[PDB]
Design a binder for this molecule. Structure first.
Ligand SMILES: [K+]
Ligand SMILES: [Mg+2]
Ligand SMILES: [Mg+2]
Ligand SMILES: [Mg+2]
Ligand SMILES: [Mg+2]
Ligand SMILES: [Mg+2]
Ligand SMILES: [Mg+2]
Ligand SMILES: [Mg+2]
Ligand SMILES: [Mg+2]
Ligand SMILES: [Mg+2]
Ligand SMILES: [Mg+2]
Ligand SMILES: [Mg+2]
Ligand SMILES: [Mg+2]
Ligand SMILES: [Mg+2]
Ligand SMILES: [Mg+2]
Ligand SMILES: [Mg+2]
Ligand SMILES: [Mg+2]
Ligand SMILES: [Mg+2]
Ligand SMILES: [Mg+2]
Ligand SMILES: [Mg+2]
Ligand SMILES: [Mg+2]
Ligand SMILES: [Mg+2]
Ligand SMILES: [Mg+2]
Ligand SMILES: [Mg+2]
Ligand SMILES: [Mg+2]
Ligand SMILES: [Mg+2]
Ligand SMILES: [Mg+2]
Ligand SMILES: [Mg+2]
Ligand SMILES: [Mg+2]
Ligand SMILES: [Mg+2]
Ligand SMILES: [Mg+2]
Ligand SMILES: [Mg+2]
Ligand SMILES: [Mg+2]
Ligand SMILES: [Mg+2]
Ligand SMILES: [Mg+2]
Ligand SMILES: [Mg+2]
Ligand SMILES: [Mg+2]
Ligand SMILES: [Mg+2]
Ligand SMILES: [Mg+2]
Ligand SMILES: [Mg+2]
Ligand SMILES: [Mg+2]
Ligand SMILES: [Mg+2]
Ligand SMILES: [Mg+2]
Ligand SMILES: [Mg+2]
Ligand SMILES: [Mg+2]
Ligand SMILES: [Mg+2]
Ligand SMILES: [Mg+2]
Ligand SMILES: [Mg+2]
Ligand SMILES: [Mg+2]
Ligand SMILES: [Mg+2]
Ligand SMILES: [Mg+2]
Ligand SMILES: [Mg+2]
Ligand SMILES: [Mg+2]
Ligand SMILES: [Mg+2]
Ligand SMILES: [Mg+2]
Ligand SMILES: [Mg+2]
Ligand SMILES: [Mg+2]
Ligand SMILES: [Mg+2]
Ligand SMILES: [Mg+2]
Ligand SMILES: [Mg+2]
Ligand SMILES: [Mg+2]
Ligand SMILES: [Mg+2]
Ligand SMILES: [Mg+2]
Ligand SMILES: [Mg+2]
Ligand SMILES: [Mg+2]
Ligand SMILES: [Mg+2]
Ligand SMILES: [Mg+2]
Ligand SMILES: [Mg+2]
Ligand SMILES: [Mg+2]
Ligand SMILES: [Mg+2]
Ligand SMILES: [Mg+2]
Ligand SMILES: [Mg+2]
Ligand SMILES: [Mg+2]
Ligand SMILES: [Mg+2]
Ligand SMILES: [Mg+2]
Ligand SMILES: [Mg+2]
Ligand SMILES: [Mg+2]
Ligand SMILES: [Mg+2]
Ligand SMILES: [Mg+2]
Ligand SMILES: [Mg+2]
Ligand SMILES: [Mg+2]
Ligand SMILES: [Mg+2]
Ligand SMILES: [Mg+2]
Ligand SMILES: [Mg+2]
Ligand SMILES: [Mg+2]
Ligand SMILES: [Mg+2]
Ligand SMILES: [Mg+2]
Ligand SMILES: [Mg+2]
Ligand SMILES: [Mg+2]
Ligand SMILES: [Mg+2]
Ligand SMILES: [Mg+2]
Ligand SMILES: [Mg+2]
Ligand SMILES: [Mg+2]
Ligand SMILES: [Mg+2]
Ligand SMILES: [Mg+2]
Ligand SMILES: [Mg+2]
Ligand SMILES: [Mg+2]
Ligand SMILES: [Mg+2]
Ligand SMILES: [Mg+2]
Ligand SMILES: [Mg+2]
Ligand SMILES: [Mg+2]
Ligand SMILES: [Mg+2]
Ligand SMILES: [Mg+2]
Lengths: 88, 65, 100, 116, 65, 271
RNA sequence: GCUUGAGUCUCGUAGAGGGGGGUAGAAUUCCAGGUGUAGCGGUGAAAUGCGUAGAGAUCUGGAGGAAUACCGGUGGCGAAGGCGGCCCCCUGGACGAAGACUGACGCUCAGGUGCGAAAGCGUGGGGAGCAAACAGGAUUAGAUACCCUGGUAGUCCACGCCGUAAACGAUGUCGACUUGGAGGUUGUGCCCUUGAGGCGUGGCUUCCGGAGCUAACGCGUUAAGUCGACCGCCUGGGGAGUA
RNA sequence: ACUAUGCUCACG
C-alpha cells in the first residue's frame, strides 16, 4: 500500500516541504503512484474484483481533484499533468 | 473416549462419549443440512434462548403460590 | 527485509545430517544481509500422530530475517528433499527469544 | 489350534442392526453375529435386547479360541451398545476397555438429502 | 478463569503445549469460551495456535489415530 | 493463441488458428535437418498398407534429440521453432561448448532460458533426469521405456506422464491414456509438460486443410459395394451387419492387444 | 479568504475482504491383499439391491476427488452477491491515537458503465460423495409423487457468456437533530499491573423499551420520530410484467 | 407410515 519511503519521496518533491502533505498537487501524485503500482497486480489476477473497486475509487478520486485543480488554477493544472503523464 | 476404569468396576460409566461427540457425527452429518437451514434453525434456537433469558428476569411476578 | 519463523522436521536416520543441514541454510541467508536471530534445535521429539508411517521426528526452529528471494529458495529445498518431513514459514511481527 | 489370550469385540451398531464381530489383537476375524442372524426381524431387530442376544450368540461360537478378556469398539449410534456391553459381562468375559470408532467426517462428503 | 494474568496481555503462542493443553478436551477437540471463560480475541488466537500445533504433530487432531 | 477467423469466405467461416507469436519467423538451422520423402501409405511392395495418406506439403525432418545425453553441460534456449513433422513445437538449444540441437519445447520455456541435463542437475521444467532422481508425484514427458534409448512416451503437444510410485528398481507411471505402466527407474524423463497445448483447439475449417496435412478422403464402408467392404450394397442406406473393418475383424469394442511379452509391465489397463 | 464538511500523510489494531500458489488431517467411494461365515442392506412394514464366485464385518497397503469436525457466537469482514483447516506471495478497504497539511475539493445521480447467489449455456480438463432426468421395488383407487435400491447431466476446475432470486432489514443514498437500560464486539485514554481491576470516550453490532409516529402490527439515537438534498418508483383487481 | 371428496341459492 505504497511504502513510507515512496510516499515521503513524492511528498518532499511536489509540495513545499515534508511538512506539507495534503496539497492537490501531492494528493494526485500519490494516487497516480499507487494506480501505476496496481497495473502489475491487475495484469495477471484479473478476477480480483474487490481490489479493482479500491482502484476505481482511487481513479475517480483523482479525477475529482484534477477537475477541481483545473477550475481553481489552469497554470498549475497543466504543469502537474506533464510531470505525472496524465490525459493519456 | 478411551476409557479403562481401572480394574474392579466395569459398570460402563462413559459419559466421556455422551458429553463430547455422538450427536455431532449422528444427528447433523447423517442427512443433509441445506446450507440456509442451519442459519434459520440456529437463529430461532438463538432467539428462543434470549426470549427465555429476558423472561427469566421478568419471571418474578406476583405468583401467590 | 521480512522476518520469518521456519520450523522443519527431519527423519530419524538423517538426524546426524541436521548439524550439516543447518550450516547450509544459515550460509544461504546470512550472506544476504539478514541475520539469524535464534538457534534452537528441539531434538528427536515424539509425534502426536504418525507421519509417513513412523514416530519420532527431529524438529528444528530457525527464526530468521531475509528477503523474499532467499526464503522461497529455502522453501523449495524442503519439497525437493526426502529427508525433511514437513515444514512451515510464519510471518513477521519483529524478532523474538526463548519459548519451547 | 491358535488359542488366543485376548481379542477385540467390534460392535457395529446402526439404527437397523447391531453386528457384533469378535476379532483378535491384530484385527483378524474369529467370528460374528447379528440382530438379524439371531431371529428378531424388522421392528424387533432395532432394539437393545436383540443386540444383547446377538452378543450372547457371539459370546459363544468363539470358545475354541478361548478369549479371557477383550476390548469393546462400538460404532454408529443404534439402540444397542448401552445394553450390548452388559451382555458381554453376563456372558463370561472381562472388559479391559471400551472405545468408540464412530467415524466423524470433518465436513468432508455431502450426506444424502433429508427425507419426508 | 479468564485471560493470562493481570499484567499479562501477551499473545497465545503455539509452541508451548503445557498451558495450551488446558484449552482442549480429553478427546482432542477445542473447548469453547462459554466453558473456560476467555475473551473472544484470545479464543481466536488460541484456536489458530491449536491448528498450527496440530499441523506439526505437537497436539493430536483426535484420539483415534 | 487460439484466434477464430472471420467468415469472409465459406470454408474460412469455421477456421480457428493457433497463432504462436513467440515462434521463429525465419529459415531453420540447416545442420540438424535432413530430407524426408513421403510414402503415400505404400511400402516395400508398393502397396497401400495404410489408407488415407498421400499428398500434402513437402516437409523436412528435424533431427530432434530425444535421448538427451550430453551431460553436465548447461545449454541456453536460442529460439522456439515450428516443426512440420510434429504436433509439438521445438526449441533450438545452444550448448555452452558450442553445439546446437533441437528438443521438444516444454510448457514454461522461452528464448533465453537455461537448461541442464544428466544425473545431478536441478528439478525444473526442461531438465532431463533419470526417473530415480525425479520426485514421486511429478509431471514429466519425453519418457524412455528402456534405459539408453531415445524417448517414447509423452511427446505430443500438451502431453505429459505423471510418476505415481517407485518400487525399488521400477517406477510406476500413469500415462495420458489412463494406463498405469511400470518402467525401469534408470530410464530418463524430461521435466514438465510438452508445450503447444492449444494445438487441440485448432479446427481446420475446410476439406482442403486436411489435404495439405497429407490426409486423403476416407470412404465409408456403407457407401461401397459388397465386394469391396463387408458393409456394402443394399438398395438405399441399408446396414444390418455388426460393425467391422474392411478385413472383417470387428471394430467398436474388440480388444486387439495381444503382445504378451510386455503384459508384466502393465499394472492397470486404461479406462 | 476561513475551517468545522470532505480528502492526504504519520503510528498502529481486528478481521472466513480479495486474487494466485502450496500443504495437512478425518472421513466417504474404490482398488488389490489377509482374516473369516452367513447373511448384509433397508423399511411404518416389505421388496428391488447386494452376498456361499465367500458379501457384510474386520484389518494392510495404495489411488483419487470434494469438503474443511471441534474453535464458531444473534462473533467478524465485504458495496451488494457473498466470504470459514493451516502456510507463504501480491493486494483492497475499515477503525483508532494525537498532530500537520489542503482549503468546500462536497451530496445526489436520468442515460452510461462495472460487479452481481443458485440454476443454466459454450470450449477444454476432472469426477469420490451427492443427485435433476431416468430405471427397478414399494405405497395407492391411481402415484408420471412422498419412502426404498440403483443412477446420467450437474455440483469441482480454467476460461468466456448469462444478468436473474422472498438478490429481504419485503425499509434508496448522504447529512443534521430529540428521554433510557442490559449486552456483544473491536479500539484508545486516565489510574495502583498495586491481585482475573477503577473510571472515560471512539467504530460496528444484537435485544427490550420512552416520547413521537403508525391503519394496526409494530418502529423507536443503527427511527417507520423531527427536517433538508437528490434519485428511483406507485395510482383498483384480473388481462399482464403477458402481447 | 400413506389416507380423496362434499352439486345451486338462501340469516333487512
Ligand atoms: K453466477
Ligand atoms: Mg490507497
Ligand atoms: Mg490508504
Ligand atoms: Mg500548498
Ligand atoms: Mg461534478
Ligand atoms: Mg445462510
Ligand atoms: Mg523392390
Ligand atoms: Mg523404396
Ligand atoms: Mg516389388
Ligand atoms: Mg484414416
Ligand atoms: Mg498425388
Ligand atoms: Mg511425418
Ligand atoms: Mg505429418
Ligand atoms: Mg502428428
Ligand atoms: Mg537387477
Ligand atoms: Mg479411416
Ligand atoms: Mg472422418
Ligand atoms: Mg469409415
Ligand atoms: Mg453404390
Ligand atoms: Mg480390391
Ligand atoms: Mg463381403
Ligand atoms: Mg445399392
Ligand atoms: Mg432408413
Ligand atoms: Mg430392417
Ligand atoms: Mg458374422
Ligand atoms: Mg467375419
Ligand atoms: Mg463379416
Ligand atoms: Mg471404452
Ligand atoms: Mg486548522
Ligand atoms: Mg471519513
Ligand atoms: Mg497494542
Ligand atoms: Mg484476513
Ligand atoms: Mg490480512
Ligand atoms: Mg483472506
Ligand atoms: Mg483468499
Ligand atoms: Mg483459490
Ligand atoms: Mg487421509
Ligand atoms: Mg482415506
Ligand atoms: Mg489379483
Ligand atoms: Mg479378491
Ligand atoms: Mg426376499
Ligand atoms: Mg434377490
Ligand atoms: Mg449366495
Ligand atoms: Mg456372483
Ligand atoms: Mg474365495
Ligand atoms: Mg471383501
Ligand atoms: Mg469390506
Ligand atoms: Mg485404507
Ligand atoms: Mg492422497
Ligand atoms: Mg462490518
Ligand atoms: Mg449496506
Ligand atoms: Mg503468487
Ligand atoms: Mg468502502
Ligand atoms: Mg485510502
Ligand atoms: Mg482524529
Ligand atoms: Mg481558496
Ligand atoms: Mg490557510
Ligand atoms: Mg444510480
Ligand atoms: Mg441507472
Ligand atoms: Mg459481468
Ligand atoms: Mg460471480
Ligand atoms: Mg462475471
Ligand atoms: Mg454455478
Ligand atoms: Mg458446463
Ligand atoms: Mg453442446
Ligand atoms: Mg472434445
Ligand atoms: Mg460418477
Ligand atoms: Mg445416491
Ligand atoms: Mg432418490
Ligand atoms: Mg421420474
Ligand atoms: Mg430389477
Ligand atoms: Mg419411480
Ligand atoms: Mg403400482
Ligand atoms: Mg449411493
Ligand atoms: Mg474448491
Ligand atoms: Mg483453483
Ligand atoms: Mg483461478
Ligand atoms: Mg454482461
Ligand atoms: Mg441490473
Ligand atoms: Mg426483481
Ligand atoms: Mg440474501
Ligand atoms: Mg436474511
Ligand atoms: Mg434489528
Ligand atoms: Mg425489491
Ligand atoms: Mg453513490
Ligand atoms: Mg470517524
Ligand atoms: Mg409506545
Ligand atoms: Mg408521519
Ligand atoms: Mg400504538
Ligand atoms: Mg427500524
Ligand atoms: Mg444523536
Ligand atoms: Mg447521541
Ligand atoms: Mg452515533
Ligand atoms: Mg441516519
Ligand atoms: Mg427516516
Ligand atoms: Mg409507514
Ligand atoms: Mg397507472
Ligand atoms: Mg389496473
Ligand atoms: Mg385494468
Ligand atoms: Mg416478457
Ligand atoms: Mg371429483
Ligand atoms: Mg362446496
Ligand atoms: Mg358447500
Amino acid at each position: 500500500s505504497l511504502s513510507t519511503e515512496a510516499t515521503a519521496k513524492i511528498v518532499s518533491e511536489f509540495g513545499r516541504d515534508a511538512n506539507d502533505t495534503g496539497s492537490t498537487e501531492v494528493q494526485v501524485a500519490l494516487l497516480t503512484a499507487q494506480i501505476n503500482h496496481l497495473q502489475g497486480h491487475f495484469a495477471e489476477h484479473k478476477k480480483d474484483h474487490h481490489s479493482r473497486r479500491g482502484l476505481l475509487r482511487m481513479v475517480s478520486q483523482r479525477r475529482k481533484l484534477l477537475d477541481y485543480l483545473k477550475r481553481k488554477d489552469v497554470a498549475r493544472y497543466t504543469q502537474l499533468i506533464e510531470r505525472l503523464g496524465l490525459r493519456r | 473416549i478411551k476409557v479403562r476404569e481401572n480394574e474392579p468396576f466395569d459398570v460402563a460409566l462413559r459419559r466421556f462419549k455422551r458429553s463430547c461427540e455422538k450427536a455431532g457425527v449422528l444427528a447433523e452429518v447423517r442427512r443433509r443440512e441445506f446450507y440456509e437451514k442451519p442459519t434459520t434453525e440456529r437463529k430461532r434456537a438463538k432467539a428462543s434462548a434470549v426470549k427465555r433469558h429476558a423472561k427469566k428476569l421478568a419471571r418474578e411476578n406476583a405468583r401467590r403460590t | 527485509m521480512r522476518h520469518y519463523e521456519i520450523v522443519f522436521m527431519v527423519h530419524p536416520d538423517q538426524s546426524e545430517q541436521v548439524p550439516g543441514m543447518i550450516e547450509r541454510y544459515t550460509a544461504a541467508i546470512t550472506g544476504a544481509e539478514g541475520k539469524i536471530h535464534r538457534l534452537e534445535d528441539w531434538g528427536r521429539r515424539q509425534l502426536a500422530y504418525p507421519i509417513n508411517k513412523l514416530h519420532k521426528a527431529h524438529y528444528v526452529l530457525m527464526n530468521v530475517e531475509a528477503p523474499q528471494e532467499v526464503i522461497d529458495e529455502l522453501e523449495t529445498t524442503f519439497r525437493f528433499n526426502d529427508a525433511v518431513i514437513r515444514s512451515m514459514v510464519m510471518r513477521t511481527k519483529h524478532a523474538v527469544t526463548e519459548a519451547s | 489350534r491358535k488359542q488366543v489370550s485376548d481379542g477385540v469385540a467390534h460392535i457395529h451398531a446402526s439404527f437397523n442392526n447391531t453386528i457384533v464381530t469378535i476379532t483378535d489383537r491384530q484385527g483378524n476375524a474369529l467370528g460374528w453375529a447379528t440382530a438379524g442372524g439371531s431371529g428378531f426381524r424388522g421392528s424387533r431387530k432395532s432394539t437393545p435386547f436383540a443386540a444383547q442376544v446377538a452378543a450372547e450368540r457371539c459370546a459363544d461360537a468363539v470358545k475354541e479360541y478361548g478369549i479371557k478378556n477383550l476390548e469393546v469398539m462400538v460404532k454408529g449410534p443404534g439402540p444397542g451398545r448401552e445394553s450390548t456391553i452388559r451382555a458381554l459381562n453376563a456372558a463370561g468375559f472381562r472388559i479391559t476397555n471400551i472405545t468408540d470408532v464412530t467415524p466423524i467426517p470433518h465436513n468432508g462428503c455431502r450426506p444424502p438429502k433429508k427425507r419426508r | 478463569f479468564c485471560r493470562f494474568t493481570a499484567e499479562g496481555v501477551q499473545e497465545i503462542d503455539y509452541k508451548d503445549i503445557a498451558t495450551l493443553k488446558n484449552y482442549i478436551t480429553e478427546s482432542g477437540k477445542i473447548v469453547p469460551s462459554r466453558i473456560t471463560g476467555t475473551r473472544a480475541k484470545y479464543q481466536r488466537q488460541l484456536a489458530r495456535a491449536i491448528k498450527r500445533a496440530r499441523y506439526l504433530s505437537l497436539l493430536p487432531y483426535t484420539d483415534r489415530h | 493463441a487460439v484466434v477464430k477467423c472471420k467468415p469472409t469466405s465459406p470454408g474460412r467461416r469455421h477456421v480457428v488458428k493457433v497463432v504462436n507469436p513467440e515462434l521463429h519467423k525465419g529459415k531453420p538451422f540447416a545442420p540438424l535437418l535432413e530430407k524426408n520423402s513421403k510414402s503415400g501409405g505404400r511400402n516395400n511392395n508398393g502397396r497401400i498398407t495404410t489408407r488415407h495418406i498421400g499428398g500434402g506439403h513437402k516437409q523436412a525432418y528435424r533431427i530432434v534429440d530425444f535421448k538427451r545425453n550430453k551431460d553436465g553441460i548447461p545449454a541456453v534456449v536460442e529460439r522456439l521453432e515450428y516443426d512440420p513433422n510434429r504436433s509439438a513445437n521445438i526449441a533450438l538449444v545452444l550448448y555452452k561448448d558450442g553445439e546446437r540441437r533441437y528438443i521438444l519445447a516444454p510448457k514454461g520455456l522461452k528464448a533465453g532460458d537455461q537448461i541442464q541435463s544428466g544425473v545431478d542437475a536441478a528439478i525444473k521444467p526442461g531438465n532431463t533426469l533419470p526417473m530415480r532422481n525425479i520426485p514421486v508425484g511429478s509431471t514429466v514427458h519425453n519418457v524412455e521405456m528402456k534405459p539408453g534409448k531415445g524417448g517414447q512416451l509423452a511427446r505430443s503437444a500438451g502431453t505429459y506422464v505423471q510418476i505415481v510410485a517407485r518400487d525399488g528398481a521400477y517406477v510406476t507411471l500413469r500415462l495420458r491414456s489412463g494406463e498405469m505402466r511400470k518402467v525401469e527407474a534408470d530410464c530418463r524423463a524430461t521435466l514438465g509438460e510438452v508445450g503447444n497445448a492449444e494445438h487441440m483447439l485448432r479446427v481446420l475449417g475446410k476439406a482442403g486443410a486436411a489435404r495439405w496435412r497429407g490426409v486423403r478422403p476416407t470412404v465409408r464402408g456403407t457407401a461401397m459395394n459388397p465386394v469391396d467392404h463387408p458393409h456394402g450394397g443394399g438398395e438405399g442406406r441399408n446396414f444390418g451387419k455388426h460393425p467391422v473393418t474392411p478385413w472383417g475383424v470387428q471394430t467398436k469394442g474388440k480388444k486387439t492387444r495381444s503382445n504378451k511379452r510386455t503384459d508384466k509391465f502393465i499394472v492397470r489397463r486404461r479406462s
